[PDB]
């Protein structure tokens, strides 16, 4: 924070003339060298802004609900990386819906989930080491393919310097709890995965690795982060009866 | 603009001897100068082109059509956000689909619609204030959901320096009068509705708010922009008959 | 002026992520380093903020009203000065009273002479040269006391950069044609003469010399400048009769 | 000073082609830079130009005539003052006009006193000490009225760093030997004493402490300082008779 | 241009006390601050002023006249350079004496030729190409011999930034219609190739190329350039008869 | 000058161990730290190497023997030049011969005059003025052709800083005393005239004016001077006879 | 040499948008940056292209042909200098004729010697010395003068950094085996003698000292070094007979 | 290296005029800025050399020999650090005569031993950590004590960043097998030990840890270095018999 903020300095007069802060005065002039500065690289501006960027979506828009699901300790030799999980599409629907349900109920609001993310978070298990984590993916397979446990790297995704890598999971293939902008119902998972087309296909198969030369040990907590966007009416809760 | 360029200077001979502009040889100088610096740096732009930005869509490639929709005021309570429009999707089809054609027939070339943007545009309405304007949306809900006319604010977008905020309406959902790269055939919106699958569903609800602790009036007009890549033949118009 | 003012790029959302101009990204970066600069010295602007400067009289509050006199041209031996004025302290009222009430007449608001200054222009009358200008003066002298025409140079004023210098005439001594915020009542001459009390005592005897070691020929221009405040009513001038 | 002004190198004419000195094109071109620096910032310099400055009074226009009074060492507690001077105002006349008229006589031109100041030089009596000055004053009391020898401390007056205080009496109150631009005449004490209306109420009652915090000594020399414009006329002193 | 030029601020007199511009303040501040610079570098420029450069012979003294001769295209290999001009001795004297004459006439001053330069100019016949030009030139040969058409590159001169080489025609070899300061007198050409002793051996034999690794095509205009000073007294001009 | 040199600090062994001034290896460091800079611009260098500048002819190689001819006092209107001197050749001779040989007689060692220069000094004759010099001039003429006294300024020379313009007077037209590398001879000027071919012809004919938009006077020193190479042997001056 | 020239990052498009390498883009900022730093100082360009430089002779224009003529040792006393050679103009004459000749033949193309010049290296004997080299020249005497072997130094010549100094010897007094653009004829050095018109008088007399207080051994190499221009045509050379 | 070192640019000599290379020129004025610099700053140098540092032993003055003794592994616990070695007083000289006897004969030379130091070389035996070392040591003790295998770290030495640490054995307590400048003669263990005075007290006893807060594992070699100043004769070697 500021002290005077930008209202530093007084004035007063005497004999009629006006007497004004120096200090006031010379941030005046300061203020105009600036203003000329500003507009000198105006025309850098407009070059700059034919491209843009992307705000970050965790820290952008809509609310943050991290529904963490487990945790698991990992050693992976170099150039390789172990299999994080390996459950079927039906677990993951099952967990996926069940732990989101249980969570969040009662929901009272409208709202809408934007975005659905798998989120890894990784640690190290000793201190006074030096690597970085890397990750691959798949989204889906034939139901019967059952993932190697462990694989050697090839270009693999860097995690980023938080140690945090989440990965969108689209509307199409995984299926959500609550599709639009809607109200909830009654609902149960049986209803829930009965209308999902293929719940064995689609199921997130993440493996981490690390850039170290000798073994690490890891420590692992693997969340579903739902982005969600809420439409509360600017109304009072009262005690019924109402009036 | 500049003067003379890059074509400073100039040279003659007096005596079989060479003489050229001491300006232009000072020009030199500093520009080898320049160019071991770009040489200097050229390792640390390899670092950052790792990663890209994304042009401008509307400043970019492809042309703009802006089919203005309408007008509206509205007053709106600090913390809260008021709705935009309420359409049903039929209606939003009827719009969409009678202002784009009727402005743009006749349509004389082949073209395709990169993509189809809805607009807000925002202005205040009364002079000397401080404030910032903000905004919120759903793409979709029950037929029968009638949206609340007003909202409390909970992490809204915040609405660009230039006061426009424009959203894109993709091409699964939200049905566009040229799929793809063709020539227009007779048609007509019974014909276009009617080849729609989920009419009703997909519709534009759209709220808008300010940072201001105080109410404010707003002025916003509504558009659906359209961007279009047009393949006209390198060939005359002739009065005919030709030749 | 500016081209954007401080409105430059735009924002837009793709898949429900936010996009905005990297040009105005990069000005809120450099704007929050601006920021902490602000910080850094406003301990410095505190201890400037202990003194004070003198608003300029003459393009500060008030209006101005020059009521030119005369022109006269002087020719002046180096490390000398001549007289400019050496009117009695009655001709110096008769001009002071006539020229400021005929000029400004009709007066049709309430006002108030804030202040009376004395205005010497001064320019050279030949090219490519290179000198500057002084001054001296007295306010009042024995109504017998004749001036010297001409004197030599010890610690005069300086002449600013712009030819021009200006010399308060204070409330005391100095009689004004308004003396408070009045409406103007029927007024000559000789009853303004008679309510002054010591009428030939107060008279400007200014004299002007240069920093040349030659002949220099010098124009001048003499006026009184008047700094007056209206009090001009929040109303319409109507043709009689009103309503 | 400088050695050749900014009138470095020279030129030569070799068939019919003009040679000029490397260094004073060089000077040429780094002035041309400097200029357009100068027009860059001459808005700023509007800005500024809004506000003033006041010329100090002693460096400035009229001659300085220092009439040393008296001295006199004090030691003075931290956080108190002491009394420098206790004169009735009958005793500060007879300084006033005994001293400066028998220092300045014969007084053989026309001439007016600007303005009266009271002096104040301290110095320290000690050497390896590290204070700085105090002053407090009163230009009148109550004849019967006696000062207190010393006071404590509060909101008081911070000498200067050259340890030279001075203090303006103004023509109201405090009474010059010579009030206008006048020559000098017969004059007397008593003659003096007896036209001025209030020669008992006006004094200077003047105080002195430290920032120390330990007792200091001090050695303190006052003087009257008087700021006179002299008219002498442009004409020589001739032995007697003239011509 | 500037505004104010170097005459910013301003200065008036309140009770005495002279006021000057902040802005004019700071500025003679900063030009002390520039002028003890100025003093730190002028034992450099004394370094510098051991060498000189030489003025430009067209933006410098005398006045041009520019009797361009004729214009040509030529398409030039890589590493070869095309002849420009095979004029014989004599009908180059030709060229030059009657297209100065015819166009220069009345000659009604006192004048004489500086200089006389061969020039070529030379611009592109493509666009969105990337070269230089380059030259050669000899300015005699045995009458009979005749000059290659095109020649193989070998260390030529390279063409200035502006595309215009001048090569300088010394008074030796090069006969000139005026030889020194007088008036004209009756000529003609007859008279005029008699005197000159050896009309058939100096002429200009100029190449033109690229640094281009393809044909390139040029368009060039080929002038005799005359540096004149005229003697033209300062009277008038009158119709006859005078006075 | 310097008080250390480059030898600053020094150096001591204490058991051993070897000392040295932190100062001096201070120095060492920022030594190495320029070294790497003068390597780094090296490349820069030799760009501007391709180019060369002319050493000052008179701070340059030969000593300048400067033969004053006459002064002269010339009032110049704005825009015209005022003829300096109007010798005939034989005129001009007579007083280069007379003036050189009387001034260097005895001459006591081989030499050659390496060049002869006219050289113009101008000064101003008022005080507080602000122009610069101009300067024309021819070098021959027809001997029954009379220069105009006065005439209009046309692109003319700018005279240098210093106000001082030396023109060269080549081998070529204008005739020296003494040719080449030589012993002075038994030598008269009748026998010296008689030898140059064109006497008459040859004749420097010099006007000057100002940049001044008033009349200015002007005093001007006419000198002849002369760069000489001696050669001297390197051997005792004895008093006959000779050991 | 550079990596990716100017040819940095890449593009790409997704879903109808454009991205671009970030480091590209801020590569368009930067060089907008740098654009707008150009228009700002081009006027400071303008004022030094108002003169000139010459390009160097040897790097520059034509090529060179360095004909060695010998070596030779020198001691020199401190402020003197010692001959290098006094060779008769006949002597000097039979050295470039013939071993300019010997050296270029076959001289297969037509020529032009642009200029002749003698040059003179230097180099030290003795390590660890710190000392420059000084010269004089004379290019002509009467012939039965012989130069001193030995001379006093006064205002010598100073040898450039790289302890090589060339004269160039002009095409007046100093005679060319090649004297215009021409191919070789039958020659020999008796046809060469006879056509020059004064073989006696011209020769290089050349010394040679140093800026040493103590005595200094130095090795001489001195070549004649010609400036030459070749006309080669664009054309095959063929065994006999030729198609 | 440099290219042409401080020798760049040339000269040459046209018409008695001196051209230089303008690199070479501009070298020159900037050398001269810098040499003002230096002199600026000389008197700062002048405080900063009334303080010295030492040159390092091992890079300064003497030869190295380094008698490597032993290697060996160790793990430590955080906090903690381990004995290198507990060799008695005589085991430590019968490995420091032995070694450095064996190795060094045969000894051929005069020569003196400058120092004896303890190097203790440290190396992490696992990659991809991060930590630095620690050192503490005694020099002597009871002969029947025996130190600890393992201490806690309290205040230890920290090992330079090259993970060397070198121990100085001064010439009191730890003999040396040559004490001053001296001849080899026949010398033998037995006759060494018996010469010490106090063969069993003086003994290195080092210790060893990290910074880590894990266990690490470590590689540790031993070395003693010797420091040597030879005084090798400046003659011949040859095969007997000599001449």
Redesign the interface.
Known sequence: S???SRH???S?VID??????????????RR???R?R??????????????????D?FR????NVRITLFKEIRRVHPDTMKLVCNWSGKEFLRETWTRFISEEFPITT?Q?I??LWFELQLRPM??????KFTMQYALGAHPDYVAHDVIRQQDPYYVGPNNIERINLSKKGFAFPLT????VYNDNFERFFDDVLWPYFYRPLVYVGTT???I?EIMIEVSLLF?I??????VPLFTGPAY
């Open positions: 500021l002290r005077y530093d300095g007084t007063c009629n003339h006006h007497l004004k802060s120096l200090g006031a005065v010379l941030n005046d002039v105009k060298k600036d000329i500003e507009a000198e690289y105006e025309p850098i501006i407009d070059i700059a802004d034919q491209y843009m960027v992307t705000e979506p952008g828009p809509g609310k409208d809408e934007m975005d000793h201190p006074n080491r030096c690597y639009c902008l809607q109200s170290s030369a000798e690490e982005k966007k809420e439409f509360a009416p600017d």
